[PDB]
Structures are given as structure tokens and as C-alpha cells.
Amino acid sequence: DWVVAPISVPENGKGPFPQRLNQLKSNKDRDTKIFYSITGPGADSPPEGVFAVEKETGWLLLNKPLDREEIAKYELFGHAVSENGASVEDPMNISIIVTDQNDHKPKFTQDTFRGSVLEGVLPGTSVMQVTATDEDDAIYTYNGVVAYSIHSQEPKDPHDLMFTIHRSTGTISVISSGLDREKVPEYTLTIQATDMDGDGSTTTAVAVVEILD
């Protein structure tokens, strides 16, 4: 059968609402009067009334701006019904895909993360993992794609770059020899998490590393 292609609707649209997405039509309408309707989540089950059809004209309408982070996709059936009350067609699948906007910044799961590591480890040893989440899409776009970096280390003894952080996983690793509890018992790493794979918004948190024995 000929069917509606999936309609892409960006989230957070400016209107005007209700907004026309597509006009539903059965050719049998030259022969008798046709009444259009839609079913499914978004239509007549929760969340109800997000979409509507104009029963005479067949206009599918979006009633309000959409949020991808709430529902990413709607699937409905359009129904064509005679003046009598009989179905004049098989129901037609209607797909609405909500495309993503970068409308969320990265949030660290806490403000300070505490970890520890033994005082004699060789470059290339995991210490701890920090996490920042972004609620936007990471599959089709970079909006939800977080890049981690160390902004600074305090203090700079024995020298500055003692640690590294995995850009995708926020795993912090020792990368230089020379950790010693007697000299330096604790480091503070200022961490950044930047969405759009490091081109979007930056958020900052802190990682405190205890040097053990």
C-alpha cells in the first residue's frame, strides 16, 4: 500500500499550534463522505491529545511543542470511516519522529568525587571513574556526547601531568611515576565535561585523589 512516510518533527518547535503535519485522505471520498480519526499513545491513550485529526478535512495536527527527552517517537493509526460508521480502509501507520535539540548541558553525578591509589604505581593504572550525564541524543547526534578533560591538577608536585582522564569514560589513570604519600597525600583534579563531543557547553567538577600506602 501507499502510506505516509515517517514525519520528522524537531523538539521545542515555535508553532503556530496546532501545527499541520500531513493531510490524510482516502480516494473513496469521491463516492461517500469520509470521517478521519487517529488512535494510539499520543492520540486517544496516554499521553492523550498530543496529536489530533480534523475529522472532516483529514488534517493531522500537533497540538503543542514536543520534548524528545519525554517521548522520542509516536506511532499511531489513522482510520477512515464512512458516514454510516464502517471502516473504508485498513488503518494506516503514522510515524512521528521527534528529532533532538541540544537543550541539555552535561551534569556531573556529584560535585566532588573521591578516589585513591597506591603510592608506587607505574604509569598506566586506573584510579577512579567520574561521570557526567547529558540527556540529549547520543545516537543520531553529538548533543548528548560528553567529552572529559582534566583542566588542572593541584598541587603541581612532583610535576603537572601526573594523571590523565579517558575522554569518553571519565576514567582517571596514573600516567607518571613518582607518587609518594609522605610528599603529597592528596591531589585535586578539576574536571570538565563538554557535550557536542567537546564543542558544546562545559561543566566543571572536582576529583579528589588520596595517595595510599
176 counts as binding a copy of itself under rule CB under 8 A: yes
Pairwise CA distance, residues 154 & 188, whole Å: 5
Asked if 96 contacts 9 with a C-beta cutoff of 8 angstroms, the reply is: yes
Q: Select the span of 10-18, 97-105, 145-153, 168-176 touching a copy of itself (CB under 8 A).
A: 168-176
Q: Select the span of 20-28, 69-77, 107-115, 152-160 touching a copy of itself (CB under 8 A).
A: 69-77
Footprint (CB under 8 A) of a copy of itself, residues 25-54: 37-41, 43-45
Pairwise CA distance, residues 30 & 42, whole Å: 30
Interstrand relation of 147-154 and 163-165 (parallel, antiparallel or unpaired): unpaired
Please report, as a single letter, which amino acid is at residue 45: S
Q: Which of 3, 83, 103, 123 binds a copy of itself (CB under 8 A)?
A: 123
Asked if 184 contacts 155 with a C-beta cutoff of 8 angstroms, the reply is: yes
CA 113 to chain centre: 24
The grid coordinates of residue 79 equal 482510520
66 counts as binding Ca ion under rule CB under 5 A: no
* Residue 136 binds which entry of a copy of itself, Ca ion, none, CB below 5-8 Å type-dependent: Ca ion
Beta carbon nearer to a copy of itself, 93 or 101 = 93
Q: Which of 129, 131, 149, 190 binds a copy of itself (CB under 8 A)?
A: 129
26 counts as binding Ca ion under rule CB under 5 A: no
Pairwise CA distance, residues 65 & 13, whole Å: 5
Footprint (CB under 5 A) of Ca ion, residues 93-152: 100-104, 134, 136, 143
φ, ψ of residue 54 to 5 degrees: the values are -80, 115
Binding site for a copy of itself (CB under 8 A): 37-41, 43-45, 75-77, 79, 81, 85-87, 90-91, 93, 122-126, 129, 139, 164, 166-169, 171, 173, 175-177
